[PDB]
């Protein structure tokens with residue numbers, strides 16, 4: 110076969126082999142500077158776990174010298190190891206997202222709590238947030254408490270503020286698998302005498318979470334998202350492997366009561382991104398065997414839909430997002446009775462395409478992610494007449510954006526002038542596979558050649574990460590590189 114089909118075959122063998130007997134693809138998260146700095150400040154303040162704090166310190170120094178992250182995470186590390194204002198500006202430099210205002214408050218309060226700058230001079234209600242992802246309520250309350258105590262106004266804190274932090278005192282792994290949220294809550298809780306009896310036991314577990322490199326990961330892992338994406342890729346191969354069945358079973362038995370899926374085992378918060386991948390996978394690999402879970406996932410998505418036709422990530426009434434809306438459109442299009450909601454979602458996508466053919470950055474920091482999501486919805490949903498033309502013109506502009514920004518090596522990076530990486534290129538490939546058939550030396554041809562070239566001798570891919578959280582801060586789940594390249598090659602072959 111062609112070099113691309115051979116590449117696809119070697120990668121599929123590797124992804125199949127990585128799926129365990131429990132049907133899950135392990136997907137641990139790498140250490141991150143931000144959480145390792147917060148863990149270091151917490152353990153230092155409590156004079157606890159000397160061995161762990163020594164390793165955290167060495168991890169932070171090594172990482173700053175060899176692989177420094179964005180300016181905000183660097184300023185955080187420097188504050189705990191020891192300009193805050195300019196680092197925050199460069200970190201949120203052109204962060205064009207509906208959460209920018211909240212991120213400015215969050216990030217500045219983090220830095221102030223670590224003694225690098227003053228606390229924001231804002232009304233205490235600024236830390237109020239409507240219910241969204243479960244752990245966000247806890248994070249904002251933690252920051253409010255830290256600011257209240259940090260500025261000398263502890264009496265400001267109300268019992269409803271403390272109550273939101275109680276999950277951080279539970280034994281074992283972090284609530285919702287989110288180490289950042291627990292660390293912020295514990296930094297706040299250590300200021301409360303009536304909560305300190307529970308603090309000692311949890312610092313022991315926090316300290317035990319360190320990874321081999323001495324750091325602390327953002328989250329425990331992303332095995333639900335990764336397993337679902339990998340099953341989708343494998344189910345798109347000409348002859349899908351047998352393992353797709355235990356993978357579908359592993360996902361289905363983890364569904365939440367609302368019918369959706371969280372990003373890892375034990376995450377009770379469902380989200381649209383995870384659910385759409387599981388739904389797409391189950392629809393292809395086990396539509397009868399898991400008919401009930403499929404129906405429950407569709408119901409989950411429809412219950413989240415916003416009145417504007419778009420879909421949020423976590424909760425109805427939070428701002429719709431383009432990538433989530435395109436994903437839900439594609440996932441819901443397999444039933445002809447949801448046509449009205451699918452059409453309204455695709456129209457939302459078209460309405461929000463930018464004048465240069467792009468869409469948005471949100472949970473991915475490359476522009477190609479939202480392009481690939483949008484192009485699949487624009488070209489995957491059936492449509493005719495006026496609506497077909499409108500969607501085809503929008504898809505054409507998106508694919509033209511890809512062609513206009515393709516790097517010389519055939520790949521794409523996080524931004525137009527960034528070096529290529531396999532994940533960003535994988536997303537572009539999925540979109541381009543909906544354009545005209547590949548030709549010698551054309552954009553899709555060259556992107557496939559790039560991916561062929563970047564394959565490791567062990568058949569895998571090592572990529573710069575693209576996932577962000579809290580946005581726009583990158584975190585690294587290495588298992589995703591192989592999975593998304595395979596999804597790209599399955600789409601394109």
Ligand SMILES: CC(C)=CCC/C(C)=C/CC/C(C)=C(\F)COP(=O)(O)OP(=O)(O)O
Pocket residue numbers: 208242245287328334372380382383422472576577578579580581
């Ligand atoms: C699965 C995908 C790709 C999309 C949905 C987001 C998920 C479930 C990602 C897993 C990691 C995680 C806890 C976050 F990114 C949420 O960040 P955080 O709550 O800090 O985000 P902000 O709302 O503050 O930006």
Ligand SMILES: [Mg+2]
Pocket residue numbers: 245248579
């Ligand atoms: Mg957050």
Ligand SMILES: [Mg+2]
Pocket residue numbers: 244287289290578579
């Ligand atoms: Mg978080």
